[PDB]
Design a protein around this ligand. Structure first.
Ligand code: SF4
Ligand code: SF4
Ligand code: SF4
Ligand SMILES: [Br-]
Ligand SMILES: [Br-]
Ligand SMILES: [Br-]
Ligand SMILES: [Br-]
Ligand SMILES: [Br-]
Ligand SMILES: [Br-]
Ligand SMILES: [Br-]
Ligand SMILES: [Br-]
Ligand SMILES: [Br-]
Ligand SMILES: [Br-]
Ligand SMILES: [Br-]
Ligand SMILES: [Br-]
Ligand SMILES: [Br-]
Ligand SMILES: [Br-]
Ligand SMILES: [Br-]
Ligand SMILES: [Br-]
Ligand SMILES: [Br-]
Ligand SMILES: [Br-]
Ligand SMILES: [Br-]
Ligand SMILES: [Br-]
Ligand SMILES: [Br-]
Ligand SMILES: [Fe+3]
Ligand SMILES: [Fe+3]
Ligand SMILES: [Fe+3]
Ligand code: NA
Ligand code: NA
Ligand code: NA
Ligand code: NA
Ligand code: NA
Ligand code: NA
Ligand code: NA
Ligand code: NA
Ligand code: NA
Ligand code: NA
Ligand code: NA
Ligand code: NA
Lengths: 169, 169, 169
């Protein structure tokens, strides 16, 4: 039907140094699957896995999935064998059985929640150091305050802004 | 009516080295506004801004607002020009148009939530290092435990409290 | 009735260098209390304190409680005087009145929530450094990526996996 998607994929991955399975009809088969999965669930859900029909919960199995590279590295193929390793293509690598590396649902949920908290921390802290203010010190009385710029005049001794200095530490 | 509040303000700010607008009637005008805003919303909501009639959401525009000092520094006046800069009062500073520095509602909410998380972290950690316990080491068997004081006797070898030592590291 | 529990306790604590009150009948009294509290609430709630009949909220007063050791250290006895200090048993230590060290309900709740946040941080961060990936660098073009192992081939220059190196810093 559409061979268009097969070929544009083959070129997309070859540029980046990955490889599709060299057997053509088995691969185009998987392509049909991916297409159908896109029609049915609205994302490219791994063609050889049960989709949960919820994108958020499947982000790890949208093709290419999070298991592809480790699986290529250990077994010479991704779980469906859509992709095969640079080693298999040539010789060595001996394309072989691939266990399911994806963790079970409960485990995945824990991992996500942990990545959520971790991202929130990093966000909050990055956003933080962005709004922090430098500390200014009056050179007459030593008054300290925290502002982008030193105040017009020291509320203590009245020295002008230009007589403050950035303070450390 | 009440000029009482005008004058007590003028003295309150002059002590700290800020200045009210030298035009008297324009300033007392703003004072009336602030008073009314206090009657209407129960806080001194910036007289030249739309109040949301919720204190929590307006903490940034209670007068004096969070934009006053940066605005004095850049434009020689706060957004309403209740306050004018030390430079304008004398010469230079050329009192000039002030854009609205306050971010729009969505932005403000994000910023607040980020300051909330940041404060929770800092709180939780400060509260944390306060309850942490030192580590005590039996000098006979090396048993380690974490308590304000070493135990009456080592549960391992039975050496008395006075034969423990603070441990590092 | 059951003296079984009295004696197994006396041996359990003596091994660890704690001591029960040497008056036998006052102690076995407290034992009966602890038993009853176990029948009534399903945990060994301090026999001389009001139980809230909720384990989660009483974790600090399950016997032995969190106040036992500090109380032994300062007063020579736990709050009920189930336990007496190594000093009292012999001489010195002068067993004496013990105030209630447990903080009031509101305080306890705050402390717990703070320990919760602190534990979540530590968990999230520990779980974090466990999933972080090393950074690999192509030795031909300097391409950087973060994975357990370097890719089959550099998506940039095509150098094979074995021509990458662990990168710092
Ligand atoms: S396993 Fe192969 S096919 Fe299934 S998603 Fe991962 S990469 Fe795409
Ligand atoms: S702008 Fe001027 S008047 Fe309005 S709140 Fe800030 S300081 Fe008070
Ligand atoms: S006070 Fe004494 S009896 Fe009550 S719980 Fe703490 S240790 Fe057990
Ligand atoms: Br079709
Ligand atoms: Br998608
Ligand atoms: Br990998
Ligand atoms: Br590869
Ligand atoms: Br497989
Ligand atoms: Br100046
Ligand atoms: Br400076
Ligand atoms: Br009036
Ligand atoms: Br107020
Ligand atoms: Br400023
Ligand atoms: Br000023
Ligand atoms: Br303005
Ligand atoms: Br001692
Ligand atoms: Br010591
Ligand atoms: Br009974
Ligand atoms: Br229990
Ligand atoms: Br202690
Ligand atoms: Br003791
Ligand atoms: Br007591
Ligand atoms: Br290789
Ligand atoms: Br290396
Ligand atoms: Fe000063
Ligand atoms: Fe010891
Ligand atoms: Fe390269
Ligand atoms: Na996607
Ligand atoms: Na599952
Ligand atoms: Na500032
Ligand atoms: Na200024
Ligand atoms: Na206020
Ligand atoms: Na707005
Ligand atoms: Na302690
Ligand atoms: Na003790
Ligand atoms: Na327990
Ligand atoms: Na209480
Ligand atoms: Na990896
Ligand atoms: Na590989």
């Amino acid at each position: 039907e559409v061979d268009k998607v097969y070929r544009r994929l083959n070129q997309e991955v070859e540029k980046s140094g990955y490889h599709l399975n060299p057997d053509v009809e088995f691969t185009k088969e998987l392509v049909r699957g991916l297409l159908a999965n896109e029609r049915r669930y609205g994302y490219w859900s791994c063609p050889c896995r049960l989709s949960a029909d919820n994108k958020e919960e499947d982000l790890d199995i949208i093709c290419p999935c999070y298991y592809r590279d480790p699986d290529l590295n250990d077994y010479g193929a991704c779980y469906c064998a859509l992709y095969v390793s640079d080693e298999v293509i040539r010789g060595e690598k001996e394309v072989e059985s691939i266990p399911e590396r994806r963790p079970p649902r409960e485990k995945r949920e824990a991992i996500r929640a942990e990545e959520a908290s971790r991202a929130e921390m990093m966000e909050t802290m990055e956003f933080t150091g962005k709004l922090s203010k430098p500390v200014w010190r009056c050179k007459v009385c030593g008054y300290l305050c925290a502002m982008d710029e030193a105040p017009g005049v020291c509320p203590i001794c009245k020295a002008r802004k230009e007589r403050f200095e950035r303070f450390m530490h």
